Amino acid sequence: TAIEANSRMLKALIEIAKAIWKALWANSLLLEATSRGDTERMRQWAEEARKIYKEAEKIIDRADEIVEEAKKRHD
Amino acid sequence: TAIEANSRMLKALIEIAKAIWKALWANSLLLEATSRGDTERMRQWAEEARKIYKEAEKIIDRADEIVEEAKKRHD
Secondary structure: OOHHHHHHHHHHHHHHHHHHHHHHHHHHHHHHHHHHOOOHHHHHHHHHHHHHHHHHHHHHHHHHHHHHHHHOOOO | OHHHHHHHHHHHHHHHHHHHHHHHHHHHHHHHHOOOOOOOHHHHHHHHHHHHHHHHHHHHHHHHHHHHHHHHHHO
């Protein structure tokens, strides 16, 4: 019964993984920006990351919500 | 009864991913601070990023603690 919420929390975890993926891409763009020594793409990934952090917060909320959705149906 | 194993290992997985996200966002803030316009950030990361890290560290350890326990329940 909670396995539905397992699949769904898995998707949510994949969304968390997407967030992490974009964070890594942000690290890449930062390695790009510091290599070229600029500060544009820095603010690019910065803003993108802030957005994604907000969305990551929400996604994790819904994730843990789905965890609670899986958890309540106990034993 | 399988949903049990699923949910357990999945919550574990999620928290460990969240640990990755803890250390990640820690280094991320540090990367925002890695612009090198301030060095007092030493105290910031050395404590706050250290806390969630050691939090992130043992969560993984105790997350694994139940990984071993689940599998061997059929002994």
